[PDB]
Amino acid sequence: LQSTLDNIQSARPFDELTVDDLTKIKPEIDAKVEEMVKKGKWDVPGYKDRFGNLNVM
């Protein structure tokens, strides 16, 4: 956990993280995405709780 905090101190791409890097790091998110795509349920439960919509509607 010292290694974790030391990495997080200066290796935290908050505004410059690559989505391809995120996919390569964790294949679990890829597996989830293809599973839910092939299932047809495009909803991602719990997605408007923290992210706004600015909906003109």
Binding site: T4, N7, S10, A11, P13, E16, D21, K24
Partner: protein
């Protein structure tokens, strides 16, 4: 009747239940993490990469490219406007 021994049984299960799932979720992404904008790849050249860098970048993000495209399509269409009518 005797002394059972709790204070050294954390070996089988790490302390806490809910943050245990988040531990593996947040410890693994820090290894392959960009220190500070590693491999930005801000420079490219494929006969259209210069246009993307100059205009289609997030720094400006203005409506000028749309107006330039409209001017270009007007210039292209003037010739066939003359040709047709």
């Amino acid at each position: 009747v005797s002394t059972l021994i709790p204070p050294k049984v954390v070996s089988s299960k790490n302390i806490g239940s809910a943050p245990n799932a988040k531990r593996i979720a947040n410890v693994v992404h820090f290894y392959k993490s960009l220190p500070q904008g590693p491999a930005p790849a801000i420079k490219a050249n494929t006969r259209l990469a210069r246009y993307k860098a100059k205009y289609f970048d997030g720094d400006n993000a203005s409506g000028k490219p749309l107006w330039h495209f409209a001017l270009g399509i007007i210039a292209f269409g003037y010739s066939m406007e003359y040709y047709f009518h």
